[PDB]
Subunit: 92 residues, 3 copies
């Protein structure tokens, strides 16, 4: 699995959540953060996604979050050594 961390504009959050839902991504968390390069409000989404589907998930976010202006944000794809589901204790 990989961990996707995306920093997007607040005004694009609904488009992004919609695109993720249509791309079949359901499990995620998000929070408000302040960003720079004078700080601007941003929304940080964190999504665990298995390798075959990292590319499609990143694409949905890129398409939905873009405005074309400086300050659109970034998407980080981090490696994950192990992931566990707390409901069952199982390593996913």
């Amino acid at each position: 699995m990989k961990l996707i961390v995306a920093i997007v504009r607040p005004e694009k959050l609904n488009e992004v959540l919609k695109a993720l839902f249509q791309a079949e991504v359901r499990g995620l968390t998000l929070s408000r953060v302040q960003g720079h390069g004078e700080l601007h409000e941003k929304v940080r989404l964190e999504i665990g996604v298995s390798e075959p589907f990292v590319k499609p998930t990143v694409e949905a976010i890129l398409k939905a979050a873009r405005t074309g202006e400086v300050g659109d944000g970034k998407i980080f794809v981090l490696p994950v050594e192990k992931v566990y589901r707390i409901r069952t204790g199982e390593e996913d």
Copy 2:
């Protein structure tokens, strides 16, 4: 070294922290995030040495479980290096 990111139910937070402290886990940070029709969750971020990875994961898994959908997940992330600001000590 690893960076453990755990998403747990707020009502399980106290039990989780108690279990971590008993497992000799010490410094960590936490914040509230919205996750999935979203629900509030507590996101813990814990830096640990290799010998503490298993004990930390085990503690959260036993303490945060309710068996119902939405219990959360635990991500164990690789860390290239970590620095303690006070002492300037670096661990890899």
Copy 3:
């Protein structure tokens, strides 16, 4: 690229931000978190390889007070970073 996650004292934040800016490290996000509880500020900064040490040093120098609880700096391997404005990788 690497992703740097730093936990610093709120009273040292402006000093940390100034030091980063001076080091040419401008793109980042931050948020308030609770530590150990005591409020802390968490910075998340994606940087190219040559900027890892300059970023770590800027924070180490500006955030230290000498008292226990000054924070930590994590350097994480990042596999890919995309610039949303262009839809391109970096």
